[PDB]
Amino acid sequence: CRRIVPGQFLAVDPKGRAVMISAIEKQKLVYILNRDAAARLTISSPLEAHKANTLVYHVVGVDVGFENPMFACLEMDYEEADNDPTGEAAANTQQTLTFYELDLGLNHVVR
Amino acid sequence: DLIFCRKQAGVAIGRLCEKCDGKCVICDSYVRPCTLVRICDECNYGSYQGRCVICGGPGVSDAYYCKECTIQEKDRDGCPKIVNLGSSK
Amino acid sequence: RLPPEVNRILYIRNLPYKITAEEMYDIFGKYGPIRQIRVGNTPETRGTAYVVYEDIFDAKNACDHLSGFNVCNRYLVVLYYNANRAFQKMDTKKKEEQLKLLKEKYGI
Amino acid sequence: SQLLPLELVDKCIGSRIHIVMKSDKEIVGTLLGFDDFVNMVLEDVTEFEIRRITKLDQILLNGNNITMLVPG
Amino acid sequence: LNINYNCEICGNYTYRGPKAFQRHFAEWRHAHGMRCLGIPNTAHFANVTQIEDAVSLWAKLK
Amino acid sequence: QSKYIGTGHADTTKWEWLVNQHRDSYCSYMGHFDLLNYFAIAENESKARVRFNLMEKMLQPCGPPA
Amino acid sequence: ERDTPGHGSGWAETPRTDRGGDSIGETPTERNRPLSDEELDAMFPEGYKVLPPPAGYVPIRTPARKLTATPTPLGGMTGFHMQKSVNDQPSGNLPFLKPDDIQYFDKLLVDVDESEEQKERKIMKLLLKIKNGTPPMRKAALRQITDKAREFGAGPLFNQILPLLMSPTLEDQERHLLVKVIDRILYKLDDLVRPYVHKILVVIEPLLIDEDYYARVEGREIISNLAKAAGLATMISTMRPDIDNMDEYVRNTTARAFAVVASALGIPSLLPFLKAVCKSKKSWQARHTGIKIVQQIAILMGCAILPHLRSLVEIIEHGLVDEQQKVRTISALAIAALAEAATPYGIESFDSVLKPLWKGIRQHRGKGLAAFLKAIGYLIPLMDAEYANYYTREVMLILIREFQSPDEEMKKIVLKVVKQCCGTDGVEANYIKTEILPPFFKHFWQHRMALDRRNYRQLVDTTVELANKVGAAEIISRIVDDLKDEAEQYRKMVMETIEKIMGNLGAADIDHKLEEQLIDGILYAFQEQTTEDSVMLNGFGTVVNALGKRVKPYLPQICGTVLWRLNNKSAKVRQQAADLISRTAVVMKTCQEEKLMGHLGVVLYEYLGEEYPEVLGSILGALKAIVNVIGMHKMTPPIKDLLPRLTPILKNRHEKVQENCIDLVGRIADRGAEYVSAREWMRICFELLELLKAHKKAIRRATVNTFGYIAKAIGPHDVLATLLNNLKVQERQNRVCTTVAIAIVAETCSPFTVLPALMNEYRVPELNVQNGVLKSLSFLFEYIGEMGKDYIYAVTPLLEDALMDRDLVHRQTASAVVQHMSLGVYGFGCEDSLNHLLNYVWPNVFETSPHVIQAVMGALEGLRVAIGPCRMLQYCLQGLFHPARKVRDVYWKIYNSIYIGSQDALIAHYPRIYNDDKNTYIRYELDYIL
RNA sequence: CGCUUCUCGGCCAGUGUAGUAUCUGUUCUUAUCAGUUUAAUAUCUGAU
């Protein structure tokens, strides 16, 4: 159990193409899948979503049939929350929904 | 001048030349190979297909890690494809 | 038929600290017209001098014969001066006037 | 310090040699080998009277009638 | 030393030596100006002179 | 080291060090299923409301900086 | 000053316009250009007077030219006369001054003190001790400058280097070093270099664009170190004006600069700049550059270009349509390079590019044309073989019509294309067989090509891939007949080509008759070798090992040549034939031609008296591989004969010998090892021992492993007793290999035997052998692992003594022992002691001595896994906040190392901490009690 | 090459990259305060 190393939350596409995996914080990686020559499951090489100082509440596979896939990282930044001597940023931050988007052709993953 | 690339660890098997051949990469050592090397095709590509993870020659074999670096769990950090001071590629 | 490095300047050394522009101008005067001269007058550069001519081939004839030439009891180190280096103590500015001038008279 | 003649023949092995009989005959070919009696094995040897034949293969030349050996 | 110099973030203060500046940076008052300014201490901000630039640098930090 | 969070240096403040170990306490508590269930039992809630609460307390703990 | 700078540029070209126009109307009607006293106060440094001797003096000067022709033609000649000196001129230096260099180091022709800056310049001639002198001088002086970095400051330095890194006559070694100084001081100065940055690149960039491979890589290294070292906006604001600089050279290079600075600071930092450039509407020359930049970015950043791919391209498209040509040209060229880093990716990002490209293909004449190919070709792999299908089918035409050009840029291009076009899965076999081949082998395979380097390679590749498709016999059939063409490099080429092909495709396809033509060939080539080259040799080996028992009828002709050659032809060619045996051993075996094995065994055996090293080496090699096929007890020179026959060779000094020998001795003393009576061995031991003077690693490598093999044959005590005596004078870690013997030995019978001998031998007062025994334990535990669960006790007190000081080295090496032990034991339950030792370790924590420290870091890391954190952390609490800096530095470095691993464990082990006013440091959770 | 004599023997000053350790020589225990600096000193920076 780490703070930064994935395996905590786990999500995966309807079409099974690719699967996203994430820690709680800072790391979201993605493994792509395609069945082999004989249709036996071959695993891609990883990728990276990294974004600093960001809390991932929960992640969920998304539905787009045969597209570049999407994912939902529920997030929050705490970086506002540190550099606020007061304790205002403690409140008055809202957790940020972001959809990441795998993109095969380019093969990186973009907010 | 000579230090790691530590880009993310892919599925690509490592490749070592004649010279480097015995060496557990980080512990520098021949002892007790057990487990296997992975680097990013970013680090490992093309002219680097079967290239030495050290010297820039053709890979004749596959670096095995020691056990020593194993229990200290270092093999799982960024891909040990050494970049020299000059453009690695 | 010439090496590119050599330039209208020569570094010139092994001089006495009494020595005369009269001597100098005369001797060097052989090969060709003097653009001008400098003499190190300063705590370090006392003893050396620069020489520059209206032509290189002038100077070529110079470093040719004057090579190791004698004055008094000393053999003068005779060298083609380097360049670039420390000059930028000045700046290139003062085009504007002049190039307006060629801009003007000849109209070109 | 002395240069032995058999040592001189030894080093011309695998080279081209001219072998000059005591007669008016001569052979040039590659020196393959020799014995103590200086019988001689030549390869692809031209035979001359001072061109008689082009030999192909190996010739044993009887050391008996040999007079001069010439490397080259 | 004894060469004219100035730190902008500290009271537009004057310093007479370049070796002196590093010592000033690892200093009580210099870090008080940074931290009380909202620019947190130690080693990223060492090369600071003016107050302005390290503000965008600290925005780059957080 | 730097891009690996929780790294310290000799300038490390009291406050930061402790907030660190808070957070890590948490990703453990979300981690170790049982430990979690322990909490749940004691103070009566859902598993969920636990994890939720925690993930609130993540950025805060100890309250504002100094 | 920047604005000023560019002002000076627009100046410069306005001037060239004035002159060039002056000879434009003057032609309607350089360095020698006359000078002004401001211009004349511009060159020479500070500190010189101009003169006048006299207006009569300077009048004769004014008279000089007119009287240079005039008095060039007049009377003179010079007459010597036959007839207490002084004044010894002071020249040279400890590393000495070349004659030319006087100009730089002149101020070391003065001898003074009491001048202050000038004492810093006059002290910076430490350079000369860099530039010339002895190696040690270079070293020490070099550091002395490094730590004097901050102090003198860049300004004085670069003021005093760049002349030398500009030296018309500067040495290559001198170059590379003076680079070393520029890097090294650039590890330090950061903010400092700003005013100097351009004033650096101007020297360096030439180096980056460098014929020498190692030159370049240095260059890039430092241009990053600078660019990252300086600031981004520094780099930019610096380097615009070189873009439009008249000289294409400085542009060209200026690009590769921007390539590097971009590898440093990332593309996206720099994009909006580029993207600005390619939309510059003033002039094209820029755009020619900016595009180039895109390229060299492509090449350098390579596989990593991927993400901003789309943006980059979104720059470059607006070129292809341009009115100017080059800009088209270079542009497309970039697209190529992109794709070549793109590989099979980002296809549609290139997407909007194509449709011009294809059209462009049609209408062209010239270098540009084939360039567009260079692209498309690198595209096709990226398409869908249905879309790619179509588009392919269009190209292979133009490709056809274009084989024939005289241009070489061309033939490279169209070549690499075919690799890709017909290098495809979705292309049909026959079609190649018909249209392409006959041209292909026609125009390309010619002697123009192979003499050149690249074309050689690129060719081989291409032909290979046409094999991977249309089959083997097709190709090889057509190029066999050329092994017997005379000139070498050509032959070499056909040879390697084939070698690969029967590499990939396999021999199995080849017919018969053709095959006769092979082996007849591959001898005929092999019989004539200008140098000895791996090519024909390997190429052969592969030939055979592919043909397998199809080969068998051909031996007698082989081994016949193998011997014949083997002899004579004088010795240079010998080693070759030797190797030839080396590789074909396996084939001589399984087919069971034993008379052959009689032949080889024995006749090689004779040569082992050959005096040339470079034969005997290859000879043994052959022997080794001969052993790996026929077992010991069937060896025709039965080992008893052999192995001693080797034995005396080991003096041989020369390399290749020592290698193949010790190798051989090893195999045999491993495998048979009974054949030879013990006495002989112990002679072998006392001969091995000084093989440990080997400059080389591999020798010592197998050397050791042998030392073990025999140590098995005999039994331990002696062989360590004997090793105890050895390696007395090994220099700086040279002997260690002996220690490695103590180790491996100590395994290969129960170490549980050997210790008492060893331990006791740490008694001896001689210091360095003491530490020796310590390492012995080190490698020892590293090699034993689990087993340590016993003898641990034995060492522990000893580790206490050694670990307590005599000197550092004791603590260093010993501590290492703690490491490898601490891992090996793991979790069998012997911690207690290891805790105990932890104490005597601990204080060592503090030191600057790099080896001692990285040693200790070794220790405590391992010890962590053995003891567990909680104990460790209980040494690391107090340290964190200790007022001093020194301690906090370290206890933090430790606590990190504890921290990264086993972060998951800790939670338990942070102690309770009382909450203050603004905050709560007590984690209340854990105290919830059911 | 053979024989005879005598002597002896065998068997039943390399190099390269990085880095530390350790002697000796030379200078200072010496006036106040203000800043930089240090765990505290020290050290460094100004004037009477």
JSON list of N, CA and C in Angstrom, two decimals, chain D residues 19-52:
[
{"chain": "D", "resi": 19, "resn": "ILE", "atom": "N", "xyz": [63.62, -22.70, -60.73]},
{"chain": "D", "resi": 19, "resn": "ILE", "atom": "CA", "xyz": [64.59, -23.76, -60.49]},
{"chain": "D", "resi": 19, "resn": "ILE", "atom": "C", "xyz": [65.38, -24.07, -61.75]},
{"chain": "D", "resi": 20, "resn": "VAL", "atom": "N", "xyz": [66.69, -23.92, -61.64]},
{"chain": "D", "resi": 20, "resn": "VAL", "atom": "CA", "xyz": [67.59, -23.94, -62.80]},
{"chain": "D", "resi": 20, "resn": "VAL", "atom": "C", "xyz": [68.42, -25.19, -62.79]},
{"chain": "D", "resi": 21, "resn": "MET", "atom": "N", "xyz": [68.12, -26.09, -63.72]},
{"chain": "D", "resi": 21, "resn": "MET", "atom": "CA", "xyz": [68.82, -27.37, -63.80]},
{"chain": "D", "resi": 21, "resn": "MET", "atom": "C", "xyz": [70.29, -27.19, -64.19]},
{"chain": "D", "resi": 22, "resn": "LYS", "atom": "N", "xyz": [71.08, -28.24, -64.13]},
{"chain": "D", "resi": 22, "resn": "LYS", "atom": "CA", "xyz": [72.46, -28.10, -64.56]},
{"chain": "D", "resi": 22, "resn": "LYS", "atom": "C", "xyz": [72.50, -28.06, -66.08]},
{"chain": "D", "resi": 23, "resn": "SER", "atom": "N", "xyz": [71.38, -28.40, -66.70]},
{"chain": "D", "resi": 23, "resn": "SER", "atom": "CA", "xyz": [71.23, -28.35, -68.15]},
{"chain": "D", "resi": 23, "resn": "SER", "atom": "C", "xyz": [70.64, -27.02, -68.60]},
{"chain": "D", "resi": 24, "resn": "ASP", "atom": "N", "xyz": [70.10, -26.98, -69.80]},
{"chain": "D", "resi": 24, "resn": "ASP", "atom": "CA", "xyz": [69.52, -25.73, -70.27]},
{"chain": "D", "resi": 24, "resn": "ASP", "atom": "C", "xyz": [68.02, -25.63, -70.00]},
{"chain": "D", "resi": 25, "resn": "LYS", "atom": "N", "xyz": [67.57, -26.31, -68.94]},
{"chain": "D", "resi": 25, "resn": "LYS", "atom": "CA", "xyz": [66.17, -26.33, -68.56]},
{"chain": "D", "resi": 25, "resn": "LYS", "atom": "C", "xyz": [65.88, -25.52, -67.30]},
{"chain": "D", "resi": 26, "resn": "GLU", "atom": "N", "xyz": [64.65, -25.05, -67.17]},
{"chain": "D", "resi": 26, "resn": "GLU", "atom": "CA", "xyz": [64.26, -24.19, -66.05]},
{"chain": "D", "resi": 26, "resn": "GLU", "atom": "C", "xyz": [62.79, -24.40, -65.73]},
{"chain": "D", "resi": 27, "resn": "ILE", "atom": "N", "xyz": [62.42, -24.26, -64.47]},
{"chain": "D", "resi": 27, "resn": "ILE", "atom": "CA", "xyz": [61.02, -24.45, -64.10]},
{"chain": "D", "resi": 27, "resn": "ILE", "atom": "C", "xyz": [60.61, -23.34, -63.19]},
{"chain": "D", "resi": 28, "resn": "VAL", "atom": "N", "xyz": [59.51, -22.66, -63.48]},
{"chain": "D", "resi": 28, "resn": "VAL", "atom": "CA", "xyz": [59.00, -21.71, -62.49]},
{"chain": "D", "resi": 28, "resn": "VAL", "atom": "C", "xyz": [57.60, -22.05, -62.04]},
{"chain": "D", "resi": 29, "resn": "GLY", "atom": "N", "xyz": [57.42, -22.13, -60.74]},
{"chain": "D", "resi": 29, "resn": "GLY", "atom": "CA", "xyz": [56.10, -22.40, -60.17]},
{"chain": "D", "resi": 29, "resn": "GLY", "atom": "C", "xyz": [56.11, -22.11, -58.69]},
{"chain": "D", "resi": 30, "resn": "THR", "atom": "N", "xyz": [55.04, -22.43, -57.98]},
{"chain": "D", "resi": 30, "resn": "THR", "atom": "CA", "xyz": [55.03, -22.17, -56.55]},
{"chain": "D", "resi": 30, "resn": "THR", "atom": "C", "xyz": [55.76, -23.27, -55.83]},
{"chain": "D", "resi": 31, "resn": "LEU", "atom": "N", "xyz": [56.69, -22.89, -54.98]},
{"chain": "D", "resi": 31, "resn": "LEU", "atom": "CA", "xyz": [57.43, -23.84, -54.17]},
{"chain": "D", "resi": 31, "resn": "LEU", "atom": "C", "xyz": [56.55, -24.38, -53.05]},
{"chain": "D", "resi": 32, "resn": "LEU", "atom": "N", "xyz": [56.13, -25.64, -53.17]},
{"chain": "D", "resi": 32, "resn": "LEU", "atom": "CA", "xyz": [55.30, -26.24, -52.15]},
{"chain": "D", "resi": 32, "resn": "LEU", "atom": "C", "xyz": [56.11, -26.86, -51.00]},
{"chain": "D", "resi": 33, "resn": "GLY", "atom": "N", "xyz": [57.23, -27.54, -51.34]},
{"chain": "D", "resi": 33, "resn": "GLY", "atom": "CA", "xyz": [58.10, -28.15, -50.34]},
{"chain": "D", "resi": 33, "resn": "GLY", "atom": "C", "xyz": [59.42, -28.72, -50.86]},
{"chain": "D", "resi": 34, "resn": "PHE", "atom": "N", "xyz": [60.29, -29.14, -49.94]},
{"chain": "D", "resi": 34, "resn": "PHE", "atom": "CA", "xyz": [61.59, -29.72, -50.31]},
{"chain": "D", "resi": 34, "resn": "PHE", "atom": "C", "xyz": [62.10, -30.67, -49.23]},
{"chain": "D", "resi": 35, "resn": "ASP", "atom": "N", "xyz": [63.02, -31.57, -49.58]},
{"chain": "D", "resi": 35, "resn": "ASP", "atom": "CA", "xyz": [63.63, -32.43, -48.57]},
{"chain": "D", "resi": 35, "resn": "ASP", "atom": "C", "xyz": [65.11, -32.11, -48.39]},
{"chain": "D", "resi": 36, "resn": "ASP", "atom": "N", "xyz": [65.81, -32.94, -47.62]},
{"chain": "D", "resi": 36, "resn": "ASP", "atom": "CA", "xyz": [67.22, -32.72, -47.36]},
{"chain": "D", "resi": 36, "resn": "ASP", "atom": "C", "xyz": [68.10, -32.89, -48.60]},
{"chain": "D", "resi": 37, "resn": "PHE", "atom": "N", "xyz": [67.68, -33.77, -49.50]},
{"chain": "D", "resi": 37, "resn": "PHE", "atom": "CA", "xyz": [68.39, -34.01, -50.76]},
{"chain": "D", "resi": 37, "resn": "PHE", "atom": "C", "xyz": [68.07, -32.91, -51.78]},
{"chain": "D", "resi": 38, "resn": "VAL", "atom": "N", "xyz": [67.20, -31.99, -51.39]},
{"chain": "D", "resi": 38, "resn": "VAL", "atom": "CA", "xyz": [66.72, -30.88, -52.21]},
{"chain": "D", "resi": 38, "resn": "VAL", "atom": "C", "xyz": [65.97, -31.35, -53.47]},
{"chain": "D", "resi": 39, "resn": "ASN", "atom": "N", "xyz": [65.30, -32.49, -53.32]},
{"chain": "D", "resi": 39, "resn": "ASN", "atom": "CA", "xyz": [64.20, -32.80, -54.21]},
{"chain": "D", "resi": 39, "resn": "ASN", "atom": "C", "xyz": [63.17, -31.72, -53.97]},
{"chain": "D", "resi": 40, "resn": "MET", "atom": "N", "xyz": [62.30, -31.48, -54.93]},
{"chain": "D", "resi": 40, "resn": "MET", "atom": "CA", "xyz": [61.51, -30.27, -54.84]},
{"chain": "D", "resi": 40, "resn": "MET", "atom": "C", "xyz": [60.09, -30.48, -55.36]},
{"chain": "D", "resi": 41, "resn": "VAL", "atom": "N", "xyz": [59.10, -30.00, -54.62]},
{"chain": "D", "resi": 41, "resn": "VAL", "atom": "CA", "xyz": [57.71, -30.03, -55.08]},
{"chain": "D", "resi": 41, "resn": "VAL", "atom": "C", "xyz": [57.28, -28.66, -55.63]},
{"chain": "D", "resi": 42, "resn": "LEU", "atom": "N", "xyz": [56.97, -28.61, -56.92]},
{"chain": "D", "resi": 42, "resn": "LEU", "atom": "CA", "xyz": [56.50, -27.38, -57.54]},
{"chain": "D", "resi": 42, "resn": "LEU", "atom": "C", "xyz": [55.02, -27.45, -57.87]},
{"chain": "D", "resi": 43, "resn": "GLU", "atom": "N", "xyz": [54.36, -26.30, -57.89]},
{"chain": "D", "resi": 43, "resn": "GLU", "atom": "CA", "xyz": [52.96, -26.29, -58.27]},
{"chain": "D", "resi": 43, "resn": "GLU", "atom": "C", "xyz": [52.69, -25.39, -59.48]},
{"chain": "D", "resi": 44, "resn": "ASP", "atom": "N", "xyz": [51.96, -25.94, -60.45]},
{"chain": "D", "resi": 44, "resn": "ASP", "atom": "CA", "xyz": [51.66, -25.25, -61.70]},
{"chain": "D", "resi": 44, "resn": "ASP", "atom": "C", "xyz": [52.91, -24.68, -62.33]},
{"chain": "D", "resi": 45, "resn": "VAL", "atom": "N", "xyz": [53.79, -25.56, -62.76]},
{"chain": "D", "resi": 45, "resn": "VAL", "atom": "CA", "xyz": [55.13, -25.15, -63.14]},
{"chain": "D", "resi": 45, "resn": "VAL", "atom": "C", "xyz": [55.27, -24.96, -64.63]},
{"chain": "D", "resi": 46, "resn": "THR", "atom": "N", "xyz": [55.85, -23.84, -65.01]},
{"chain": "D", "resi": 46, "resn": "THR", "atom": "CA", "xyz": [56.21, -23.61, -66.40]},
{"chain": "D", "resi": 46, "resn": "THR", "atom": "C", "xyz": [57.53, -24.29, -66.63]},
{"chain": "D", "resi": 47, "resn": "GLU", "atom": "N", "xyz": [57.63, -25.02, -67.73]},
{"chain": "D", "resi": 47, "resn": "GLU", "atom": "CA", "xyz": [58.88, -25.68, -68.07]},
{"chain": "D", "resi": 47, "resn": "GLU", "atom": "C", "xyz": [59.54, -24.98, -69.26]},
{"chain": "D", "resi": 48, "resn": "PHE", "atom": "N", "xyz": [60.80, -24.58, -69.14]},
{"chain": "D", "resi": 48, "resn": "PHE", "atom": "CA", "xyz": [61.52, -23.88, -70.22]},
{"chain": "D", "resi": 48, "resn": "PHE", "atom": "C", "xyz": [62.82, -24.54, -70.67]},
{"chain": "D", "resi": 49, "resn": "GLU", "atom": "N", "xyz": [63.07, -24.47, -71.98]},
{"chain": "D", "resi": 49, "resn": "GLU", "atom": "CA", "xyz": [64.42, -24.67, -72.52]},
{"chain": "D", "resi": 49, "resn": "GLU", "atom": "C", "xyz": [64.97, -23.29, -72.92]},
{"chain": "D", "resi": 50, "resn": "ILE", "atom": "N", "xyz": [66.21, -23.00, -72.51]},
{"chain": "D", "resi": 50, "resn": "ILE", "atom": "CA", "xyz": [66.82, -21.68, -72.66]},
{"chain": "D", "resi": 50, "resn": "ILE", "atom": "C", "xyz": [67.84, -21.61, -73.81]},
{"chain": "D", "resi": 51, "resn": "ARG", "atom": "N", "xyz": [59.02, -22.22, -74.18]},
{"chain": "D", "resi": 51, "resn": "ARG", "atom": "CA", "xyz": [58.09, -22.78, -73.22]},
{"chain": "D", "resi": 51, "resn": "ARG", "atom": "C", "xyz": [57.70, -24.16, -73.70]},
{"chain": "D", "resi": 52, "resn": "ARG", "atom": "N", "xyz": [58.13, -25.15, -72.94]},
{"chain": "D", "resi": 52, "resn": "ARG", "atom": "CA", "xyz": [57.94, -26.54, -73.25]},
{"chain": "D", "resi": 52, "resn": "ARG", "atom": "C", "xyz": [56.57, -27.02, -72.79]}
]
